[model samples]
Target: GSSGSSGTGEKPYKCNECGKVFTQNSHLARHRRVHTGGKPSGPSSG
Candidate 1:
């Protein structure tokens, strides 16, 4: 059944700076752009 959720039926990907949650890590990473100013340019979030 496609419940629009992961197999675990949970949104595990969460933003540390915000209370936002995502079903996939990639989505969370993209959503971070709102706070990061742009797409991730390097291999560092710190």
Candidate 2:
């Protein structure tokens, strides 16, 4: 049952700002950047 492109066609992740649905959470997070204007980063240097 290991299909490479297997999916139920259910986009549950929804963007509250634009009401956009994404199949994956990562995609949703990336889209959020468009509104937040914040880049994905790790710990900042002093």
Candidate 3:
């Protein structure tokens, strides 16, 4: 049996600056600015 599925490769989540694809909504939100060369604000959350 196969345990895999195919996606359209479309991401509903996106950055207001740039559009990118991500496996998770949260990850897409975070990487948005990186694609646009925008620096992260403040210190790391961790």
Candidate 4:
């Protein structure tokens, strides 16, 4: 089953900064911010 391309779930969202696998496009966007030192700007939300 793993030999077939159709069965393989491909993540189209590829980070331009590095070669890695991202689950979702939205997540990839957030990943870019992390690389840019965009840590949670405001007060603690945790």
Candidate 5:
């Protein structure tokens, strides 16, 4: 019988700017920008 793979305690896609990790690579990339002081697109910044 085949067994299911176990999860690792480690997280992938770590942000170099803030050292934040996410389950997906894209999430980490977005979080990294926070350390750079990037403005969020919204109703503000007019």
Candidate 6:
């Protein structure tokens, strides 16, 4: 029991800009420059 939203076909990755979803964090890195034009600290991932 309790297997909802945690199995096959799940869009875990999300884009805060427009609340978009991605199956993987791949390729997205290339196009991930829209919201990456501030300082060197967006939200603290380093």
Q: What's the TM-score of every candidate structure?
A: 0.52, 0.54, 0.34, 0.50, 0.46, 0.37
Reference-based lDDT, each prediction: 0.76, 0.81, 0.65, 0.74, 0.69, 0.62
lDDT of 6 by residue, 1-46 (tens): 7867654435767776756667778845644775575465457664
Worst 10 residues of 2 by lDDT: 3-12
Worst 10 residues of 1 by lDDT: 1-10
Better of 3 and 4 by TM-score: 4
Ranking of all candidate structures by their TM-score, best first: 2, 1, 4, 5, 6, 3
Per lDDT, what order, best first? 2, 1, 4, 5, 3, 6
Which of the numbered candidates is closest to the native, going by highest lDDT? Answer: 2
Question: Clash number for model 3?
Answer: 0
- lDDT by residue for model 5 over 1-46, one digit each (tens)? 7987786336867766645568898877777768677666778555
lDDT of 6 at 37: 56
Off by over 4 Å in 4: 1-9, 38-46
RMSD of candidate 4 to the truth, in angstroms, is 7.5
Clashing pairs in model 3, backbone N/Cα/C closer than 3 A: none
lDDT tens readout by residue for model 2, 1-46:
8878955346879888978889899999899988888545678866
Off by over 4 Å in 1: 1-9, 38-46
Clashes of each: 0, 0, 0, 0, 0, 0
Q: Assess candidate 4 and give its TM-score to the true structure.
A: 0.50
Off by over 4 Å in 3: 1-19, 39-46
> Which runs of model 5 end up more than 4 angstroms from their true locations?
1-9, 38-46
Instruction: Give the Å shift of residue 27 in candidate 6.
Output: 3.1
Itemize residue pairs with steric clashes in candidate 5.
Answer: none
Query: Model 3 scores what on Cα lDDT?
Result: 0.65
Cα deviation of 11, candidate 1, in Å? 1.7
